[PDB]
Amino acid sequence: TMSVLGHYNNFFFAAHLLDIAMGFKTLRTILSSVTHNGKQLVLTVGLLAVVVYLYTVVAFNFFRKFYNKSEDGDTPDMKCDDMLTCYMFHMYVGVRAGGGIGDEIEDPAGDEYEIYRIIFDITFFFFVIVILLAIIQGLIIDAFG
C-alpha cells in the first residue's frame, strides 16, 4: 500500500526504511534492548508526566511573576496564566533544557521566594533529569545483561 502511494507522492518511500527494523533480523540485538521492557519505559514516561504535572501545579499556585518569557521587553508571553499552557511549557522546555527548569525562567532573587524557588528548581533538576532519565537509561542497560 505504501509502495503504491509512493507514486502519488515520492515520499512514502521513506516508510520503507522501517523494514530494516520490522523486517530482517540484523538489528534484533540492538532493538531487543528497547523492546524487552517496553511496559517499563511507558510507565516511566507516565511517572515523569505525573511528576511534571505536580511541579506544574506547584508553580501555577506559587510562582506567578517568574514565567515572563518576553522578547524585546514589555511583551509578556508564554506565562503560567493557564494550567494547560504552563504544563505544556514545562513538559516541552524544562525536560529538554538539560539543566532543569531554573535556567529557562527569571532569576529567583525576589524576597519570600529566594529559597523556596531555589529548592523548587534543584528538586526539579534532581528528580526529573537526574533520577528519572537515569531510570530510562538503566532500563536499556539492564536489557543487554
Binding site: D111, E112, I115
Partner: peptide, 20 residues
C-alpha cells in the same frame, strides 16, 4: 525574609548541645 535567617534558626537549636 528567610534566605539568611533560615541557617541562623537552624543553628539556634544546637545551643542546647553547645551548653552540654
Amino acid at each position: 525574609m528567610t534566605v539568611k535567617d533560615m541557617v541562623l534558626a537552624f543553628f539556634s537549636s544546637y545551643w542546647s548541645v553547645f551548653v552540654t
